[PDB]
Amino acid sequence: DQEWYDAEIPSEKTFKQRRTFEQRVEDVRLIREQHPTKIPVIIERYKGEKQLPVLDKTKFLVPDHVNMSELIKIIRRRLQLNANQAFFLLVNGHSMVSVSTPISEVYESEKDEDGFLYMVYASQETFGMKLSV
């Protein structure tokens, strides 16, 4: 392998690969006690997205009064994009929520069995390409 390894890029080992289900169940309980007004959201790059950057931080405490629009703004900031680059957030593997939906409602309806809320980001072009194969 003579390809250059960009050591700036974080490993995309996923959160569910780093800790067991039983660990995550307790992790949720602890983090919710520590931050009772925050929704604990795991945000990762969609496995098929290769143009948008990888974020160094994937574990987000999101204020429970904001809507998805506000969360999108936060992620776009961390990613450092233009109004020409954009993404969708795919929640819990299969929901694409209107940006007006309160995050508290997304948590109640879409939380994982382990108690965390999981999202992946990709451009609509990536998602469209993947759906079109």
Helix content: 25-40%
Note the total helix count.
5
Strand order of the largest sheet: 2-1-4-3
Percent strand equals: 15-25%
State the separation between the terminal residues, measured CA to CA. Answer: 29 Å
Radius of gyration: 15 Å
Strand-pairing-aware structural class = alpha+beta
Structural shape = globular
What letter string, H or E per element, gives the SSE order?
A: HHEEHEHEH
Oligomeric state of the chains?
monomer
Protein name: Microtubule-associated protein 1 light chain 3 beta
GO biological process, one term: autophagosome maturation
Family: Belongs to the ATG8 family.
Subcellular location: Cytoplasmic vesicle, Autophagosome membrane; Endomembrane system; Mitochondrion membrane; Cytoplasm, Cytoskeleton
